[PDB]
DNA sequence: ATTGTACAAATATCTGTACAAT
DNA sequence: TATTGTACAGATATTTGTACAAT
Protein backbone atom coordinates (compact mmCIF):
# COMPACT_ATOMS: atom_id res chain seq x y z
CA UNK A 1 0.00 0.00 0.00
CA UNK A 2 1.70 2.99 -0.87
CA UNK A 3 0.35 6.29 0.84
CA UNK A 4 0.56 9.89 -0.96
CA UNK A 5 -1.29 12.83 -0.39
CA UNK A 6 -3.67 14.74 -2.51
CA UNK A 7 -1.60 17.03 -4.07
CA UNK A 8 0.91 14.28 -5.12
CA UNK A 9 -2.07 12.18 -6.51
CA UNK A 10 -3.47 15.41 -8.20
CA UNK A 11 -0.17 16.01 -9.98
CA UNK A 12 0.39 12.01 -10.97
CA UNK A 13 -2.39 11.44 -11.27
CA UNK A 14 -1.62 9.27 -14.37
CA UNK A 15 1.20 7.58 -12.99
CA UNK A 16 -0.56 6.40 -10.18
CA UNK A 17 -3.08 5.02 -12.60
CA UNK A 18 -0.39 3.54 -13.99
CA UNK A 19 1.13 1.89 -11.43
CA UNK A 20 -1.70 0.16 -9.74
CA UNK A 21 -2.23 -1.34 -13.32
CA UNK A 22 0.85 -2.73 -14.23
CA UNK A 23 2.35 -3.43 -10.48
CA UNK A 24 -1.12 -4.88 -8.89
CA UNK A 25 -0.56 -2.53 -5.63
CA UNK A 26 -2.73 0.31 -4.38
CA UNK A 27 -2.60 3.37 -3.13
CA UNK A 28 -3.76 5.62 -0.11
CA UNK A 29 -4.13 9.15 -0.99
CA UNK A 30 -4.27 11.14 2.08
CA UNK A 31 -6.54 14.43 2.78
CA UNK A 32 -6.07 16.90 5.65
CA UNK A 33 -9.82 16.76 6.43
CA UNK A 34 -10.00 13.18 6.79
CA UNK A 35 -11.39 11.98 3.70
CA UNK A 36 -8.95 9.30 2.27
CA UNK A 37 -9.23 7.26 -0.49
CA UNK A 38 -7.65 4.28 -1.77
CA UNK A 39 -7.56 3.46 -5.26
CA UNK A 40 -7.11 0.39 -7.39
CA UNK A 41 -7.33 -0.93 -10.62
CA UNK A 42 -10.49 -2.40 -11.73
CA UNK A 43 -9.27 -5.77 -12.08
CA UNK A 44 -8.53 -5.86 -8.46
CA UNK A 45 -11.75 -4.12 -7.71
CA UNK A 46 -14.01 -6.62 -9.51
CA UNK A 47 -11.96 -9.68 -7.97
CA UNK A 48 -12.30 -7.92 -4.37
CA UNK A 49 -16.15 -7.63 -4.71
CA UNK A 50 -16.74 -11.02 -6.06
CA UNK A 51 -14.95 -12.53 -2.92
CA UNK A 52 -16.66 -10.03 -0.94
CA UNK A 53 -20.07 -10.78 -2.47
CA UNK A 54 -19.74 -14.66 -1.33
CA UNK A 55 -18.76 -13.30 2.36
CA UNK A 56 -20.80 -10.72 3.03
CA UNK A 57 -23.53 -13.08 3.95
CA UNK A 58 -22.62 -15.28 7.22
CA UNK A 59 -24.85 -18.02 6.23
CA UNK A 60 -23.57 -18.26 2.90
CA UNK A 61 -19.69 -17.87 3.67
CA UNK A 62 -20.44 -20.78 6.30
CA UNK A 63 -22.30 -23.06 3.42
CA UNK A 64 -18.75 -21.84 1.20
CA UNK A 65 -16.65 -22.96 4.22
CA UNK A 66 -18.28 -25.65 5.11
CA UNK A 67 -18.28 -26.92 1.27
CA UNK A 68 -14.57 -26.86 0.73
CA UNK A 69 -14.29 -28.48 4.51
CA UNK A 70 -16.35 -31.41 2.73
CA UNK A 71 -14.30 -31.53 -0.37
CA UNK A 72 -11.16 -31.75 1.59
CA UNK A 73 -12.01 -34.10 3.85
CA UNK A 74 -13.46 -36.08 0.85
CA UNK A 75 -16.92 -36.53 2.10
CA UNK A 76 -18.29 -35.82 -1.91
CA UNK A 77 -21.13 -37.19 -4.39
CA UNK A 78 -20.11 -37.69 -7.96
CA UNK A 79 -21.94 -37.03 -10.63
CA UNK A 80 -21.85 -37.77 -14.57
CA UNK A 81 -22.93 -35.04 -16.46
CA UNK A 82 -23.87 -34.96 -20.21
CA UNK A 83 -22.39 -31.40 -21.71
CA UNK B 1 -21.24 3.71 -9.06
CA UNK B 2 -19.54 6.51 -10.47
CA UNK B 3 -17.88 6.89 -13.88
CA UNK B 4 -15.77 9.77 -15.01
CA UNK B 5 -12.66 9.73 -17.15
CA UNK B 6 -8.79 10.62 -16.32
CA UNK B 7 -9.03 14.46 -17.35
CA UNK B 8 -12.10 14.84 -15.58
CA UNK B 9 -10.94 13.12 -11.99
CA UNK B 10 -7.96 15.26 -12.54
CA UNK B 11 -9.58 18.46 -12.72
CA UNK B 12 -12.17 17.53 -9.87
CA UNK B 13 -9.60 14.99 -7.90
CA UNK B 14 -10.82 16.60 -4.01
CA UNK B 15 -14.56 16.45 -5.11
CA UNK B 16 -14.23 13.12 -5.90
CA UNK B 17 -12.25 11.93 -2.65
CA UNK B 18 -14.94 13.79 -0.51
CA UNK B 19 -17.48 12.28 -2.69
CA UNK B 20 -16.81 8.83 -1.92
CA UNK B 21 -16.61 9.24 1.47
CA UNK B 22 -20.07 11.29 1.74
CA UNK B 23 -21.83 8.75 -0.17
CA UNK B 24 -20.05 5.77 0.77
CA UNK B 25 -19.85 5.63 -2.85
CA UNK B 26 -17.11 4.51 -5.97
CA UNK B 27 -15.71 6.23 -8.91
CA UNK B 28 -14.35 4.39 -11.76
CA UNK B 29 -11.80 6.40 -13.60
CA UNK B 30 -11.45 5.46 -17.39
CA UNK B 31 -8.47 5.75 -19.36
CA UNK B 32 -7.65 5.87 -23.14
CA UNK B 33 -4.96 3.18 -22.92
CA UNK B 34 -6.89 0.54 -20.81
CA UNK B 35 -5.42 1.50 -17.16
CA UNK B 36 -8.49 2.06 -15.50
CA UNK B 37 -8.93 2.46 -11.61
CA UNK B 38 -11.55 2.26 -9.17
CA UNK B 39 -11.49 5.28 -5.86
CA UNK B 40 -13.45 4.24 -2.73
CA UNK B 41 -13.33 5.81 1.22
CA UNK B 42 -10.21 4.62 3.08
CA UNK B 43 -12.97 3.70 5.88
CA UNK B 44 -14.66 1.75 2.75
CA UNK B 45 -11.97 -0.52 1.94
CA UNK B 46 -11.22 -1.01 5.29
CA UNK B 47 -14.24 -2.31 6.17
CA UNK B 48 -14.56 -4.66 2.97
CA UNK B 49 -11.80 -5.81 3.91
CA UNK B 50 -12.24 -6.89 7.96
CA UNK B 51 -15.68 -8.37 6.08
CA UNK B 52 -13.54 -10.93 3.78
CA UNK B 53 -10.65 -11.24 6.02
CA UNK B 54 -13.21 -12.96 9.00
CA UNK C 1 -19.62 -34.90 -23.87
CA UNK C 2 -19.92 -36.58 -20.54
CA UNK C 3 -17.91 -35.41 -17.45
CA UNK C 4 -16.96 -36.67 -14.14
CA UNK C 5 -17.95 -33.86 -11.82
CA UNK C 6 -17.20 -33.99 -7.77
CA UNK C 7 -19.83 -31.80 -5.46
CA UNK C 8 -19.76 -31.10 -1.88
CA UNK C 9 -22.83 -32.65 -0.37
CA UNK C 10 -24.56 -29.18 -0.53
CA UNK C 11 -24.10 -28.02 -4.04
CA UNK C 12 -25.25 -31.46 -4.96
CA UNK C 13 -28.90 -31.05 -3.07
CA UNK C 14 -28.69 -27.52 -4.61
CA UNK C 15 -28.27 -29.06 -8.08
CA UNK C 16 -30.70 -31.49 -7.73
CA UNK C 17 -33.19 -29.14 -6.70
CA UNK C 18 -32.09 -26.78 -9.62
CA UNK C 19 -32.68 -30.26 -11.93
CA UNK C 20 -36.76 -30.29 -10.20
CA UNK C 21 -37.95 -26.72 -10.50
CA UNK C 22 -35.22 -24.50 -12.72
CA UNK C 23 -33.93 -26.40 -15.49
CA UNK C 24 -32.36 -23.68 -16.98
CA UNK C 25 -30.21 -22.73 -14.14
CA UNK C 26 -29.02 -26.84 -14.78
CA UNK C 27 -28.32 -25.65 -18.42
CA UNK C 28 -26.40 -22.98 -17.27
CA UNK C 29 -24.52 -24.49 -14.86
CA UNK C 30 -23.44 -27.21 -17.67
CA UNK C 31 -22.36 -24.51 -20.11
CA UNK C 32 -20.20 -23.35 -17.36
CA UNK C 33 -18.52 -26.47 -16.75
CA UNK C 34 -18.01 -27.12 -20.34
CA UNK C 35 -16.63 -23.81 -20.33
CA UNK C 36 -14.56 -24.54 -17.55
CA UNK C 37 -13.19 -28.45 -18.53
CA UNK C 38 -12.01 -26.69 -22.29
CA UNK C 39 -10.14 -23.74 -21.18
CA UNK C 40 -9.54 -24.12 -17.70
CA UNK C 41 -10.39 -22.80 -14.42
CA UNK C 42 -9.79 -18.77 -15.26
CA UNK C 43 -10.74 -19.01 -19.08
CA UNK C 44 -13.83 -18.11 -21.00
CA UNK C 45 -18.03 -17.31 -19.90
CA UNK C 46 -19.58 -16.46 -16.60
CA UNK C 47 -16.59 -13.83 -15.87
CA UNK C 48 -14.22 -16.12 -13.90
CA UNK C 49 -12.97 -14.62 -10.28
CA UNK C 50 -10.17 -16.40 -8.99
CA UNK C 51 -10.99 -16.06 -5.07
CA UNK C 52 -9.46 -14.80 -1.90
CA UNK C 53 -9.44 -15.08 1.77
CA UNK C 54 -10.37 -18.77 3.28
CA UNK C 55 -12.02 -19.32 -0.31
CA UNK C 56 -7.93 -18.96 -1.84
CA UNK C 57 -7.47 -21.69 -4.64
CA UNK C 58 -11.32 -21.61 -5.75
CA UNK C 59 -12.87 -19.75 -8.15
CA UNK C 60 -16.46 -18.31 -9.29
CA UNK C 61 -18.03 -17.84 -12.44
CA UNK C 62 -21.79 -16.33 -12.65
CA UNK C 63 -24.72 -18.75 -13.22
CA UNK C 64 -27.04 -15.44 -13.08
CA UNK C 65 -26.79 -12.02 -11.69
CA UNK C 66 -27.60 -13.76 -8.36
CA UNK C 67 -25.82 -17.09 -8.48
CA UNK C 68 -22.32 -18.55 -8.35
CA UNK C 69 -20.35 -21.73 -9.35
CA UNK C 70 -17.95 -21.78 -6.98
CA UNK C 71 -15.39 -24.33 -8.14
CA UNK C 72 -11.72 -25.65 -8.40
CA UNK C 73 -9.95 -27.85 -11.11
CA UNK C 74 -7.47 -30.59 -9.37
CA UNK C 75 -5.47 -31.79 -12.48
CA UNK C 76 -8.44 -31.80 -14.82
CA UNK C 77 -10.97 -32.94 -12.32
CA UNK C 78 -13.83 -30.04 -11.63
CA UNK C 79 -14.88 -29.97 -8.30
CA UNK C 80 -17.91 -27.97 -7.03
CA UNK C 81 -17.98 -26.21 -3.80
CA UNK C 82 -21.63 -24.44 -4.37
CA UNK C 83 -23.75 -23.21 -7.32
CA UNK C 84 -26.64 -21.29 -5.30
CA UNK C 85 -26.24 -18.60 -2.91
CA UNK C 86 -27.23 -19.51 0.57
CA UNK C 87 -29.21 -17.30 2.60
CA UNK D 1 -29.12 20.81 16.47
CA UNK D 2 -31.72 18.67 17.51
CA UNK D 3 -34.22 16.60 15.82
CA UNK D 4 -37.66 14.42 16.56
CA UNK D 5 -37.24 11.25 15.41
CA UNK D 6 -39.39 8.01 15.14
CA UNK D 7 -37.94 4.51 14.93
CA UNK D 8 -39.70 1.08 14.12
CA UNK D 9 -38.82 -1.18 16.73
CA UNK D 10 -36.24 -3.17 14.86
CA UNK D 11 -34.46 0.16 13.51
CA UNK D 12 -33.94 1.29 17.16
CA UNK D 13 -32.13 -1.68 18.81
CA UNK D 14 -29.89 -1.70 16.16
CA UNK D 15 -29.48 2.17 16.91
CA UNK D 16 -28.79 1.57 20.07
CA UNK D 17 -26.49 -1.47 19.35
CA UNK D 18 -24.35 0.57 17.18
CA UNK D 19 -24.37 3.13 20.28
CA UNK D 20 -22.71 0.78 22.60
CA UNK D 21 -20.34 -1.06 19.50
CA UNK D 22 -19.78 1.20 16.98
CA UNK D 23 -19.97 5.05 17.52
CA UNK D 24 -19.10 5.56 13.77
CA UNK D 25 -21.88 4.45 12.49
CA UNK D 26 -24.26 6.79 14.69
CA UNK D 27 -22.13 9.87 13.55
CA UNK D 28 -23.48 8.79 10.04
CA UNK D 29 -26.82 8.04 10.20
CA UNK D 30 -26.96 11.53 12.40
CA UNK D 31 -25.56 12.78 9.81
CA UNK D 32 -27.59 11.93 7.23
CA UNK D 33 -30.74 12.78 9.19
CA UNK D 34 -29.00 15.92 9.63
CA UNK D 35 -29.37 16.22 5.81
CA UNK D 36 -32.40 14.28 5.37
CA UNK D 37 -34.14 17.19 7.73
CA UNK D 38 -31.74 20.39 5.68
CA UNK D 39 -32.57 19.05 1.82
CA UNK D 40 -35.13 16.76 1.97
CA UNK D 41 -35.35 13.23 1.71
CA UNK D 42 -33.82 12.88 -1.65
CA UNK D 43 -30.86 15.90 -1.81
CA UNK D 44 -27.71 15.57 -0.28
CA UNK D 45 -25.29 12.86 1.22
CA UNK D 46 -25.60 9.19 1.13
CA UNK D 47 -26.48 8.28 -2.43
CA UNK D 48 -30.04 9.10 -1.80
CA UNK D 49 -32.52 6.62 -3.70
CA UNK D 50 -36.23 6.74 -4.26
CA UNK D 51 -37.81 2.80 -3.23
CA UNK D 52 -39.61 1.01 -5.35
CA UNK D 53 -41.44 -2.24 -4.77
CA UNK D 54 -43.77 -2.97 -1.72
CA UNK D 55 -40.76 -0.31 0.09
CA UNK D 56 -42.22 2.62 -2.44
CA UNK D 57 -42.87 5.49 0.26
CA UNK D 58 -39.70 5.26 1.29
CA UNK D 59 -36.09 6.23 0.55
CA UNK D 60 -32.31 4.88 1.34
CA UNK D 61 -28.85 6.77 2.03
CA UNK D 62 -25.52 4.55 2.72
CA UNK D 63 -24.54 4.62 6.39
CA UNK D 64 -21.41 2.77 4.64
CA UNK D 65 -20.50 0.27 1.97
CA UNK D 66 -23.14 -2.60 3.40
CA UNK D 67 -25.94 -0.27 5.26
CA UNK D 68 -28.44 1.86 4.48
CA UNK D 69 -30.84 4.41 6.31
CA UNK D 70 -34.02 3.28 5.34
CA UNK D 71 -36.68 6.27 5.87
CA UNK D 72 -39.39 8.42 4.64
CA UNK D 73 -40.62 12.21 5.53
CA UNK D 74 -44.54 12.06 6.60
CA UNK D 75 -45.54 16.17 7.37
CA UNK D 76 -41.78 16.88 7.82
CA UNK D 77 -40.96 14.50 10.41
CA UNK D 78 -38.72 11.88 9.81
CA UNK D 79 -39.30 8.16 10.07
CA UNK D 80 -36.54 5.38 9.96
CA UNK D 81 -37.35 1.44 9.10
CA UNK D 82 -34.11 0.37 9.02
CA UNK D 83 -29.82 1.50 9.85
CA UNK D 84 -28.73 -2.37 10.10
CA UNK D 85 -28.85 -4.76 7.03
CA UNK D 86 -30.54 -7.93 8.64
CA UNK D 87 -29.15 -11.54 7.42
CA UNK E 1 -40.66 -1.58 -23.08
CA UNK E 2 -39.76 -0.78 -26.19
CA UNK E 3 -39.29 -3.73 -28.25
CA UNK E 4 -36.34 -3.27 -31.17
CA UNK E 5 -34.00 -5.79 -33.12
CA UNK E 6 -30.14 -5.35 -33.07
CA UNK E 7 -30.38 -4.05 -36.27
CA UNK E 8 -32.40 -1.32 -35.15
CA UNK E 9 -30.28 -0.49 -32.05
CA UNK E 10 -26.88 -0.77 -33.93
CA UNK E 11 -27.85 1.78 -36.55
CA UNK E 12 -30.32 4.10 -33.83
CA UNK E 13 -28.05 3.26 -30.90
CA UNK E 14 -27.56 7.15 -29.26
CA UNK E 15 -31.23 7.55 -30.10
CA UNK E 16 -31.79 4.96 -28.01
CA UNK E 17 -29.99 5.89 -25.17
CA UNK E 18 -31.33 9.24 -25.28
CA UNK E 19 -34.77 8.10 -25.15
CA UNK E 20 -34.52 5.91 -22.20
CA UNK E 21 -32.46 8.59 -20.34
CA UNK E 22 -35.00 11.81 -21.25
CA UNK E 23 -38.64 9.15 -21.32
CA UNK E 24 -37.80 6.90 -18.45
CA UNK E 25 -38.55 4.39 -20.39
CA UNK E 26 -36.74 0.88 -21.35
CA UNK E 27 -35.90 -0.98 -24.65
CA UNK E 28 -35.82 -4.73 -24.72
CA UNK E 29 -33.07 -5.70 -27.83
CA UNK E 30 -33.75 -8.98 -29.25
CA UNK E 31 -31.60 -10.99 -31.68
CA UNK E 32 -31.76 -14.08 -33.28
CA UNK E 33 -29.71 -16.47 -31.54
CA UNK E 34 -32.11 -15.20 -28.39
CA UNK E 35 -29.80 -13.65 -25.80
CA UNK E 36 -31.46 -10.33 -25.48
CA UNK E 37 -30.72 -7.18 -23.66
CA UNK E 38 -32.60 -4.46 -21.84
CA UNK E 39 -31.03 -0.96 -21.81
CA UNK E 40 -31.85 1.45 -19.26
CA UNK E 41 -30.66 4.98 -17.70
CA UNK E 42 -27.99 4.81 -15.49
CA UNK E 43 -30.37 6.56 -12.57
CA UNK E 44 -33.29 4.30 -13.29
CA UNK E 45 -30.25 1.31 -13.35
CA UNK E 46 -28.85 2.93 -9.58
CA UNK E 47 -32.47 2.56 -7.94
CA UNK E 48 -33.40 -0.58 -9.46
CA UNK E 49 -30.37 -2.18 -7.82
CA UNK E 50 -30.50 -0.26 -4.30
CA UNK E 51 -34.03 -1.58 -4.27
CA UNK E 52 -32.39 -5.21 -5.42
CA UNK E 53 -30.26 -4.93 -2.72
CA UNK E 54 -32.18 -4.68 -0.07
CA UNK E 55 -35.24 -6.86 -1.34
CA UNK E 56 -32.01 -9.95 -2.70
CA UNK E 57 -31.84 -11.22 1.21
CA UNK E 58 -35.33 -12.62 2.34
CA UNK E 59 -34.44 -11.52 6.02
CA UNK E 60 -34.02 -8.20 5.27
CA UNK E 61 -37.11 -7.65 3.11
CA UNK E 62 -39.38 -9.31 6.03
CA UNK E 63 -37.40 -7.04 8.47
CA UNK E 64 -38.03 -4.24 6.12
CA UNK E 65 -41.56 -4.95 5.84
CA UNK E 66 -42.35 -5.58 9.32
CA UNK E 67 -40.69 -2.33 10.34
CA UNK E 68 -42.88 -0.41 7.86
CA UNK E 69 -45.83 -2.03 8.78
CA UNK E 70 -44.93 -0.91 12.73
CA UNK E 71 -44.45 2.36 11.35
CA UNK E 72 -47.85 2.05 9.58
CA UNK E 73 -49.88 0.79 12.99
CA UNK E 74 -47.90 2.90 15.57
CA UNK E 75 -45.54 0.65 17.67
CA UNK E 76 -42.91 2.75 16.97
CA UNK E 77 -39.94 4.73 19.39
CA UNK E 78 -39.66 8.33 19.49
CA UNK E 79 -36.46 10.17 20.55
CA UNK E 80 -34.79 13.41 19.99
CA UNK E 81 -31.44 13.30 18.83
CA UNK E 82 -28.97 15.70 18.83
CA UNK E 83 -27.19 16.18 15.55
CA UNK F 1 -19.54 -4.28 -14.92
CA UNK F 2 -17.92 -3.60 -18.35
CA UNK F 3 -17.17 0.23 -19.31
CA UNK F 4 -17.02 1.22 -22.53
CA UNK F 5 -18.17 4.58 -24.35
CA UNK F 6 -20.64 5.10 -26.87
CA UNK F 7 -18.26 4.66 -29.87
CA UNK F 8 -17.32 1.30 -29.05
CA UNK F 9 -20.12 0.20 -27.74
CA UNK F 10 -22.11 0.68 -31.31
CA UNK F 11 -18.92 -0.67 -33.14
CA UNK F 12 -19.46 -3.98 -30.96
CA UNK F 13 -22.77 -4.44 -30.15
CA UNK F 14 -23.26 -7.96 -30.91
CA UNK F 15 -20.29 -8.90 -29.15
CA UNK F 16 -21.88 -6.89 -25.76
CA UNK F 17 -25.06 -8.52 -26.28
CA UNK F 18 -23.11 -11.37 -26.29
CA UNK F 19 -21.42 -11.37 -23.54
CA UNK F 20 -23.71 -9.49 -20.91
CA UNK F 21 -26.12 -12.88 -21.51
CA UNK F 22 -22.91 -15.78 -21.48
CA UNK F 23 -20.94 -13.80 -17.99
CA UNK F 24 -24.38 -12.21 -16.61
CA UNK F 25 -22.70 -9.02 -15.53
CA UNK F 26 -23.68 -5.62 -17.37
CA UNK F 27 -22.20 -2.66 -19.50
CA UNK F 28 -22.22 0.69 -18.86
CA UNK F 29 -22.03 3.12 -21.93
CA UNK F 30 -20.76 6.35 -21.56
CA UNK F 31 -21.74 9.47 -23.52
CA UNK F 32 -20.28 12.85 -23.73
CA UNK F 33 -24.04 14.23 -22.59
CA UNK F 34 -25.00 12.96 -19.98
CA UNK F 35 -27.25 10.28 -21.16
CA UNK F 36 -25.46 6.92 -20.39
CA UNK F 37 -27.05 3.29 -20.10
CA UNK F 38 -26.93 0.11 -18.71
CA UNK F 39 -27.38 -2.86 -20.69
CA UNK F 40 -27.75 -5.84 -19.11
CA UNK F 41 -28.98 -9.57 -20.30
CA UNK F 42 -32.63 -9.57 -20.57
CA UNK F 43 -32.82 -12.79 -18.49
CA UNK F 44 -30.99 -11.24 -15.56
CA UNK F 45 -33.89 -8.02 -15.72
CA UNK F 46 -36.51 -10.74 -15.72
CA UNK F 47 -34.76 -12.47 -12.37
CA UNK F 48 -33.95 -9.00 -10.63
CA UNK F 49 -37.88 -7.78 -11.25
CA UNK F 50 -39.09 -11.55 -9.52
CA UNK F 51 -36.81 -11.10 -6.10
CA UNK F 52 -37.79 -7.32 -6.30
CA UNK F 53 -41.62 -8.69 -5.42
CA UNK F 54 -41.87 -9.73 -1.41
CA UNK F 55 -42.37 -13.25 -1.53
C1' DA G 1 -32.65 -8.66 -40.41
C1' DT G 2 -27.86 -9.15 -39.95
C1' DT G 3 -23.05 -7.84 -38.58
C1' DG G 4 -18.38 -5.99 -39.80
C1' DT G 5 -16.59 -2.24 -41.62
C1' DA G 6 -16.17 2.41 -43.58
C1' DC G 7 -16.02 7.98 -44.14
C1' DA G 8 -15.25 12.50 -41.97
C1' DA G 9 -15.59 16.74 -39.86
C1' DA G 10 -17.10 19.02 -34.88
C1' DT G 11 -16.21 18.28 -30.35
C1' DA G 12 -13.71 16.09 -26.13
C1' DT G 13 -9.97 14.07 -23.97
C1' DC G 14 -5.25 13.86 -22.94
C1' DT G 15 -1.23 15.07 -19.96
C1' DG G 16 2.68 17.49 -18.38
C1' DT G 17 3.37 21.49 -16.49
C1' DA G 18 2.87 25.31 -13.45
C1' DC G 19 1.09 29.79 -11.26
C1' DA G 20 -1.21 31.77 -6.91
C1' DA G 21 -2.32 31.22 -2.28
C1' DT G 22 -2.84 28.38 1.79
C1' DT H 1 4.46 21.61 4.02
C1' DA H 2 0.70 20.56 1.24
C1' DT H 3 -3.39 22.65 -0.84
C1' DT H 4 -6.96 23.34 -4.49
C1' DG H 5 -8.82 25.95 -8.34
C1' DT H 6 -7.23 27.19 -12.44
C1' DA H 7 -5.06 27.53 -16.88
C1' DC H 8 -2.17 26.41 -21.82
C1' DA H 9 -2.13 23.62 -26.02
C1' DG H 10 -0.71 20.39 -29.56
C1' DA H 11 -1.84 15.62 -30.06
C1' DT H 12 -4.90 12.05 -29.96
C1' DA H 13 -9.54 9.94 -29.37
C1' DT H 14 -14.62 10.20 -29.44
C1' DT H 15 -18.65 11.47 -31.77
C1' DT H 16 -22.78 10.45 -34.87
C1' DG H 17 -25.39 9.85 -39.13
C1' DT H 18 -25.14 7.41 -42.95
C1' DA H 19 -24.63 3.17 -45.72
C1' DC H 20 -22.10 -0.79 -48.48
C1' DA H 21 -21.81 -5.63 -48.65
C1' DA H 22 -23.12 -9.96 -47.99
C1' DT H 23 -26.50 -13.12 -45.06
Do not use: W
Amino acid sequence: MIIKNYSYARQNLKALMTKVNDDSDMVTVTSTDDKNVVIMSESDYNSMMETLYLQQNPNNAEHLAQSIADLERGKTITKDIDV
Amino acid sequence: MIIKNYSYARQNLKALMTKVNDDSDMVTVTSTDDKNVVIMSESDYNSMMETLYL
Amino acid sequence: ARLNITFSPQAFEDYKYFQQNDKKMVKKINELLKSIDRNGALEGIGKPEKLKSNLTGYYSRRINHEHRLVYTVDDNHIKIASCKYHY
